[PDB]
Amino acid sequence: LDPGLQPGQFSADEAGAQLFAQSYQSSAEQVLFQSVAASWAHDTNITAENARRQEEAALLSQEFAEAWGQKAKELYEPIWQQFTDPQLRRIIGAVRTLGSANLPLAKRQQYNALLSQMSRIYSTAKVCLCWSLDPDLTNILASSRSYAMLLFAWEGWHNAAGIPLKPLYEDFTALSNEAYKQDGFTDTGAYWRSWYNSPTFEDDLEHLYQQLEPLYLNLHAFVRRALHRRYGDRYINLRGPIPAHLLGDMWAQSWENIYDMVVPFPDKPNLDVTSTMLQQGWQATHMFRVAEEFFTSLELSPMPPEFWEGSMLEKPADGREVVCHASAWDFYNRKDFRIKQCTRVTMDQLSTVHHEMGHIQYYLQYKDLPVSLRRGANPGFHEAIGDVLALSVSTPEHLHKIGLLDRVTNDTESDINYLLKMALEKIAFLPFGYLVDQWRWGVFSGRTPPSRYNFDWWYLRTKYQGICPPVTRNETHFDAGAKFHVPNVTPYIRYFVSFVLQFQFHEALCKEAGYEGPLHQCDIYRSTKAGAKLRKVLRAGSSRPWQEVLKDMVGLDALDAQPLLKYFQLVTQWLQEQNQQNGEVLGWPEYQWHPPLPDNYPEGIDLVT
Numbered sequence: 272l273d274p275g276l277q278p279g280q281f282s283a284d285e286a287g288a289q290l291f292a293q294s295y296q297s298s299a300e301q302v303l304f305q306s307v308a309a310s311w312a313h314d315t316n317i318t319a320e321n322a323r324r325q326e327e328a329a330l331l332s333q334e335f336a337e338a339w340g341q342k343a344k345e346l347y348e349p350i351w352q353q354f355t356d357p358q359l360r361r362i363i364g365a366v367r368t369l370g371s372a373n374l375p376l377a378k379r380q381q382y383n384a385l386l387s388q389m390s391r392i393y394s395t396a397k398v399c400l401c402w403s404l405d406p407d408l409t410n411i412l413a414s415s416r417s418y419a420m421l422l423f424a425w426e427g428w429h430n431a432a433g434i435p436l437k438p439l440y441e442d443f444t445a446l447s448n449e450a451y452k453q454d455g456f457t458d459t460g461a462y463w464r465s466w467y468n469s470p471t472f473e474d475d476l477e478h479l480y481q482q483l484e485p486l487y488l489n490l491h492a493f494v495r496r497a498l499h500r501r502y503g504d505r506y507i508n509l510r511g512p513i514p515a516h517l518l519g520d521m522w523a524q525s526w527e528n529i530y531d532m533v534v535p536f537p538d539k540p541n542l543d544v545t546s547t548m549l550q551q552g553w554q555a556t557h558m559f560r561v562a563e564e565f566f567t568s569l570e571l572s573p574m575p576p577e578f579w580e581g582s583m584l585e586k587p588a589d590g591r592e593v594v595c596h597a598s599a600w601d602f603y604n605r606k607d608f609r610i611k612q613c614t615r616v617t618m619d620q621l622s623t624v625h626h627e628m629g630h631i632q633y634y635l636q637y638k639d640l641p642v643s644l645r646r647g648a649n650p651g652f653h654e655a656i657g658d659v660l661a662l663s664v665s666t667p668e669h670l671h672k673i674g675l676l677d678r679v680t681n682d683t684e685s686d687i688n689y690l691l692k693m694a695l696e697k698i699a700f701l702p703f704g705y706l707v708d709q710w711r712w713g714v715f716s717g718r719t720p721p722s723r724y725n726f727d728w729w730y731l732r733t734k735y736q737g738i739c740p741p742v743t744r745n746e747t748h749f750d751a752g753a754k755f756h757v758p759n760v761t762p763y764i765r766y767f768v769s770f771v772l773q774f775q776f777h778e779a780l781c782k783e784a785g786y787e788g789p790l791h792q793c794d795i796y797r798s799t800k801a802g803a804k805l806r807k808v809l810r811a812g813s814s815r816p817w818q819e820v821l822k823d824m825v826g827l828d829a830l831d832a833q834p835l836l837k838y839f840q841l842v843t844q845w846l847q848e849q850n851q852q853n854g855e856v857l858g859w860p861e862y863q864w865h866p867p868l869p870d871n872y873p874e875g876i877d878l879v880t
C-alpha cells in the first residue's frame with residue numbers, strides 16, 4: 272500500500288476514532304476512485320487487459336481495507352459500539368467489516384478473477400442463428416409474438432449465459448462465505464440481510480408478500496387467459512404455470528411489454544407511448560434531459576457537466592464489447608458521476624433512465640457525507656428514488672404535458688387501462704423481486720448445494736411466479752446464472768423492498784405536494800415542497816437508521832403494503848371481478864405441467880428469423 276494510504280496512529284478513545292475517521296476519508300476516496308475508474312474502463316470496454324487492470328485495482332482496495340480494518344480493530348474493537356457520536360459508530364462499524372479483504376492474497380486473487388470472469392461470461396454471451404442480450408434478445412422478448420422465436424431466444428440465452436457460469440458460481444459462493452465468516456456472519460446472505468438492521472426482516476417480508484399475493488394471483492390468471500386466446504390450448508394451460516418466455520421479458524419479471532395483448536379497453540388512449548417517441552424522433556439524449564428536467568422541476572440538482580461528458584448513453588457502434596446492463600456510478604471524488612446504459616428509445620427505457628438517474632441524484636445529494644455513509648438509508652431506498660418520480664411521469668396527464676399523449680380522458684375505463692399497465696410493471700415483479708434472494712440465501716446457507724441449484728431455482732420460480740421453463744431443464748443448466756445480478760453479485764431483495772417502499776414515498780410526496788385526487792392520478796412534477804421532502808431523505812445517506820428516516824418522511828417507521836394496495840385498488844377489484852366471471856382457477860394446481868416443443872423446432876427458426 273502506498274505510504275500515503277496507510278493508517279497512522281490514533282488514540283484508542285472516541286476523540287482518536289474521529290481523527291482516524293477523518294484520515295480514512297482522504298485516502299478512501301482515492302482508493303474507491305481508482306477502483307470505480309478501473310471498473311468503468313472495463314465495463315465500457317471489455318478486454319482481457321481491462322480485466323487485469325480492474326483485478327489489480329480491486330486488490331489494492333482489499334489491501335487498503337485490510338490495513339484500515341485491522342487498525343480500527345486494534346484501536347477500537349472494545350469500545351466503538353459505546354461511542355456517543357452515532358455517525359462515528361456507523362463509520363467505524365463499516366471500516367471494521369473486511370469482507371473479501373479477510374481472504375489471504377491467493378484467495379483474494381481467486382475471488383477477484385471469479386468476479387471478472389463471471390461478469391464477462393454474462394456480458395459477452397450470445398445466441399447464434401449472433402444475437403446480443405441488449406438490444407437483440409431484449410427486443411424480441413418485448414415485441415415478438417411468435418411462440419417459436421421467443422422460445423429460441425429464451426433457451427439460447429439461458430443455455431449460453433447460465434451453463435458456463437455454474438462452476439465459477441460454486442467457487443465464488445464458497446470464497447464469499449469464507450470471507451464474511453471472518454466478519455462474524457454465518458454466511459454472506461446474513462451479511463447482506465444485516466444491512467436492514469431488522470431482526471424480523473425475513474418474517475416481515477413474508478408478511479408483506481402474503482398481503483400482496485392475491486393481487487399477483489389475479490393479475491396472473493387474467494394474463495394467462497389472454498395468452499390462452501392467442502397461443503391456444505396446446506401451449507397455455509389455464510390451470511398450470513405460464514411458459515416463462517411469453518411475458519414480455521427474458522426473466523418474466525415484469526410484463527409491461529405484453530400490455531398490447533391484455534389492454535382491457537382498446538379504444539381508450541394508447542398508454543404505451545413508444546410509437547409516439549419514435550415518430551417524434553426521440554433519442555437517448557432527449558430521454559436523459561427530460562428525466563433531468565423532472566428533477567430540477569422539484570429543485571433537486573441537475574446532472575453536472577462531468578455526467579454529460581463522461582456517461583455512456585448509447586451502445587457504442589464501434590462494436591467494442593460493453594456491459595449493456597444499465598447502471599449508475601459514483602466515482603467517490605464528489606465530481607464524477609455517470610450512467611452507463613445501452614439506451615433504447617422505448618417507454619420502459621424512459622423509466623429505466625429515471626431509475627438510474629434516481630441513483631445519481633442520491634449520489635449528488637450525499638456527496639459531502641463521510642465516504643462510509645454515502646449509501647442509501649437501506650439499499651431499497653436507493654432503488655426507490657427514480658421509480659417514485661417515474662410513477663408521476665407515467666401518468667396520462669403527465670405524458671400529455673410532455674407531448675407524449677395527445678388525447679386526455681378521465682373515465683373508469685381509462686383508469687383501469689392505466690392501473691392494469693402499472694400492474695404489469697409493478698405487481699408482476701413482486702414475486703420475482705421476493706424470490707431471487709430466497710434462492711441465493713439458501714445457496715449461501717448451504718441449504719441449496721450445487722447439486723440442487725436449478726431444481727431449487729425452478730421450485731421457487733413456479734412457487735412464486737407460477738411460470739415453468741418452456742424446454743426441459745436439468746442440473747447442467749444454471750438458469751439463475753442467466754440473470755444479471757447473480758454473476759454480478761448484486762443483492763436483489765432491495766428491489767422487492769423498493770417496489771413496496773416507492774408507493775409509501777409516492778403517497779407522502781403527493782400529500783406534501785398538496786394533491787387531493789386519486790393516488791394513481793398524482794403527478795408531483797414542479798412541486799418544490801415534494802422536492803424538499805425528498806431531498807431530506809437523499810441528503811441523509813446512511814447517516815441515520817432507515818426506520819427513522821422513513822418515519823420523518825412518511826410518518827411510519829416500517830415497510831407497509833397499504834399505499835401500494837390503495838394505489839391499485841380499482842384494478843385489484845376489477846381483476847377479481849373479471850376472473851370470477853370467466854370462471855378462472857387462481858393459481859396453477861397443475862404444477863407439473865410444461866408446454867410441448869413446437870413441431871419443427873428448432874429447424875424452422877430461419878422461417879421466422
Ligand SMILES: *[C@@H]1O[C@H](CO[C@@H]2O[C@@H](C)[C@@H](O)[C@@H](O)[C@@H]2O)[C@@H](O[C@@H]2O[C@H](CO)[C@@H](O)[C@H](O)[C@H]2NC(C)=O)[C@H](O)[C@H]1NC(C)=O
Pocket residue numbers: 668681787788789792
Ligand atoms: C378525474 O376524476 C376524478 C373523479 O372526479 C370526481 O367525481 C367525478 C365522477 C366527477 O363528478 C368529478 O367532477 C369529481 O370531482 C377526480 O378525483 C376527485 O378530485 C377531487 C379534487 O381534486 C377530490 O376532492 C375528489 O375526492 C376526487 N375523487 C376521487 C374518487 O378521488 C380526479 O381528480 C380527476 N383526475 C384528473 C387527472 O383530472
Ligand SMILES: C[C@H](N[C@H](C(=O)O)[C@@H]1CCCN1C(=O)c1ccc(N)cc1)C(=O)N1CCC[C@H]1C(=O)O
Pocket residue numbers: 524596597598599600623626627630653654761766
Ligand atoms: C436496470 C437496473 N440496473 C441496476 C440498478 O439500477 O439497480 C444496476 C446494476 C445492479 C446495480 N445497478 C446500479 O446501477 C447501482 C449502482 C450502485 C448502487 N448503490 C445501486 C445500484 C436493474 O437491474 N433493475 C431496475 C429495477 C429492476 C431491476 C432489474 O432489471 O432486474
Ligand SMILES: *[C@@H]1O[C@H](CO)[C@@H](O[C@@H]2O[C@H](CO)[C@@H](O)[C@H](O)[C@H]2NC(C)=O)[C@H](O)[C@H]1NC(C)=O
Pocket residue numbers: 316318319320321591
Ligand atoms: C479499450 O481498451 C483497450 C485496452 O484493452 C484500449 O487499448 C489501448 O489503446 C490505446 C489507444 O489506441 C493505446 O495507447 C494502448 O496502447 C492500447 N492498449 C492495449 C493493451 O491494447 C482501447 O483504446 C480501448 N478503446 C476505447 C475506445 O477506449
Ligand SMILES: *[C@@H]1O[C@H](CO)[C@@H](O)[C@H](O)[C@H]1NC(C)=O
Pocket residue numbers: 743744745746747
Ligand atoms: C441435460 O440436458 C441436456 C440436453 O437438454 C443433455 O445433453 C444432458 O445430458 C442432460 N443430462 C445431464 C445429466 O446433463
Ligand SMILES: [Cl-]
Pocket residue numbers: 463466650651762763764765
Ligand atoms: Cl439488498
Ligand SMILES: [Mg+2]
Pocket residue numbers: 520525527528619
Ligand atoms: Mg420492460
Ligand SMILES: [Zn+2]
Pocket residue numbers: 626627630653654
Ligand atoms: Zn437501481
